[PDB]
């Protein structure tokens, strides 16, 4: 029983945020409360409202009742949220949750991963990916670091893969920085045995949904 | 406006028995159930307690929940460093006709040893040079505790421009990461003999350098 959210990473002020939740491993018609929860920066959690699977009757947090609507698409096994007239006060991470089975050995709640929606007038921008090739000043005592600079993008998030997910050991992708430009920069590095540097290939897959851009770069050592 | 308030931060040693309190009004905790949620860095909230004391399956038995009047409490008996997370009580408010969450309490577990950061300073890629810009990337990882001081220098002098620096971030292993970028133009980069990232942690400092002559 899992859930996942789709939606525009950026929304313009006064426009309408629209989100979708897809459910797998359980039916959306089931007699359950499907809630939309948002978490602002500052980690404040707000309950937007829920919808009951069987009837489709909904209840909204009165602080947002006018702007909100929550609904169900039985044919897609889908849940939908619309929030109108959005301001910077709605930039947050958004989750769909199902209460979960009422039994003696329940696993508990079910939460989606959460989609960050940023509300801003500024336009989306994809990242430029330049490679972080190791110096030998980086190849100290057999193991070298090599990475991907994911520079000057907006808004969050971007996700990085190495060899299309086939290499996971030794990757640390750092939390992004908010430059005073209003643009984010981020780095992702992988730590490697120096022996591999001559034989193996390291390609990072930078992905940025809000601007529909995906970049696949290979990292190579070269003197100077 | 919080109708459920909790101490912002709470600290406890390993093995100790610690409790996080949640103070509410008559219209939510006084009369409604309280849920307790746990949230790790970068993670969705994980339900720990429902109907004031019930544990979902899989939740360690070291967690217990109580509620009386308009107050609730979460108790970790036998504190583990694994427990370092943010905790929220959650209830329903009748006055406001909406489900509400507490202010949250950030629980940290002491006794973790001090760890010095690993520091990596990458020079600018030649492509980005080709674009007339030069970004120097300084990555600082796996340190504890999470306070670190970062300073950049061109040949010998400090530089306080073009420098952008993240706040430290709790990594999954409860140690911290951070990163600092120095944004230059290609000419600025070729106008100094060396640029250096100086990161100081727990009064001890390490300085990595990059130099155009090496590239």
């Amino acid at each position: 029983v899992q859930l996942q959210e789709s939606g525009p990473g950026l929304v313009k002020p006064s426009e309408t945020l629209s989100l979708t939740c897809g459910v797998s491993g359980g039916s959306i018609s089931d007699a359950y409360y499907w809630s939309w929860i948002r978490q602002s920066p500052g980690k404040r959690l707000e309950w937007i409202g829920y919808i009951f699977g069987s009837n489709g009757g909904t209840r909204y947090n009165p602080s947002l009742r006018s702007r909100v609507s929550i609904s169900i698409d039985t044919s897609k096994n889908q849940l939908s949220l619309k929030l109108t007239s959005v301001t910077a006060a709605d930039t947050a991470v958004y989750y769909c949750v199902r209460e979960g089975v009422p039994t003696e050995a329940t696993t508990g709640d079910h939460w989606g991963q959460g989609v960050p929606v940023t509300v801003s007038s500024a336009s989306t921008k994809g990242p430029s990916v330049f490679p972080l090739a190791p110096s030998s000043r980086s190849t100290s005592e057999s193991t070298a670091a090599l990475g991907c600079l994911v520079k000057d993008y907006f808004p969050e998030p971007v996700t990085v893969s190495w060899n299309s997910g086939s290499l996971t050991s030794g990757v640390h992708t750092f939390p992004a920085v908010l430059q005073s430009s209003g643009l984010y920069s981020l780095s992702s590095v992988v730590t490697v045995p120096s022996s591999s540097l001559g034989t193996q290939t390291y390609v990072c897959n930078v992905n940025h949904k809000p601007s529909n851009t995906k970049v696949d770069k290979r990292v190579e050592i070269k003197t100077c | 406006q919080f109708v459920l308030t909790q101490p912002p931060s709470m600290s406890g040693a390993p093995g100790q028995r610690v409790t996080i309190s949640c103070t509410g009004t008559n219209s939510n905790i006084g009369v409604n159930y309280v849920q307790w949620y746990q949230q790790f860095p970068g993670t969705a909230p994980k339900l720990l307690i429902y109907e004031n004391y019930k544990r979902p399956s899989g939740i360690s038995d070291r967690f217990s929940g109580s509620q009386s009047g308009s107050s609730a409490s979460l108790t970790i008996t036998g504190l583990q460093s694994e427990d370092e997370a943010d905790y929220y009580c959650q209830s329903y408010d009748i006055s406001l006709g909406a489900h509400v969450f507490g202010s949250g309490t950030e629980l940290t577990v002491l006794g973790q040893p001090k760890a010095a950061p690993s520091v990596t300073l990458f020079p600018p890629s030649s492509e980005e040079l080709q674009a007339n810009k030069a970004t120097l990337v300084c990555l600082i990882s796996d340190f504890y505790p999470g306070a670190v001081e970062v300073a950049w220098k061109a040949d010998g002098s400090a530089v306080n421009a073009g420098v952008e620096t993240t706040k430290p971030s709790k990594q999954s292993n409860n140690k911290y990461a951070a990163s600092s970028y120095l944004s230059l133009t290609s000419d600025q980069w070729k106008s100094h003999k060396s640029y250096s990232c100086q990161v100081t942690h727990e009064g001890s400092t390490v300085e990595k350098t990059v130099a155009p002559a090496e590239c």
């Binding site: 409360y33 809630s35 929860i37 949750v97 508990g108 | 849920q35 429902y50």
Partner: peptide, 7 residues
């Protein structure tokens, strides 16, 4: 409710 459900 296990989590947020009927009041």
């Amino acid at each position: 409710a296990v989590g947020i459900g009927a009041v």
